[PDB]
Design a protein. Sequence first.
Length: 233
Amino acid sequence: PSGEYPTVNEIPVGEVRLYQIADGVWSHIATQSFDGAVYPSNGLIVRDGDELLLIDTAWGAKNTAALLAEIEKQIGLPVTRAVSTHFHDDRVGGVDVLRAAGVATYASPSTRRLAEAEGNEIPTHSLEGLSSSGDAVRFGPVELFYPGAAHSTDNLVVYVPSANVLYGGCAVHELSSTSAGNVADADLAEWPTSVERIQKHYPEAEVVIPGHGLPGGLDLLQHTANVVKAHKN
Ligand SMILES: CCOc1cncc(C)c1-c1c(C(=O)O)[nH]c2c(C(C)C)cccc12
Ligand SMILES: [Zn+2]
Ligand SMILES: [Zn+2]
């Protein structure tokens, strides 16, 4: 990639790439196959003093092991905590690897129940205070925000106040998206309302990072609403 945002075509098989978003903020990018198609996915890394906070796995056990190695190579600070932003395997697949590497894993109770029911890996610790739309809590160097049902009923977004970075996860799509992605667990009717809540809560966001694909600015929020409305119809 040589400084461009990593895509499947520039991540070697089985590997992970990092991308510097801001001072003390990186995204991580990996590739996975699902139902015979290949997808990229993102997560976040936020410096937390002399430790790191991880947001989301790298979509799979081996990808997540590779993520930890890439962090060691590129950053060299220990990952001590991880938050998963909803229950799908692109968010929790790799939690068992994290837990065996000494990382304390967290998710909302809603995510943990959904992951358990689905047969996905289950974060250890429950994040209370996020059950009502509009709720926010602090977690190390980030704020966690529950915008309401969107891509999933449990989806969380993450804001990094020091950098004005909004990590939307899978509730937010990249600008090139033409479709609403994997809508199996989505609430298409509520999704625009949930995006509006994000827009209202984080009007100073400078970088918006989707769950899959390229970061951009605030326009990703309105684009997401547009694509979801067009899909539903
Ligand atoms: C079925 C079509 O899904 C898509 C289509 N286009 C783009 C994306 C990113 C997806 C996609 C998303 C997402 O939209 O977040 N999540 C996925 C998962 C989870 C459940 C692990 C698996 C397979 C594909 C996706
Ligand atoms: Zn998902
Ligand atoms: Zn996703």
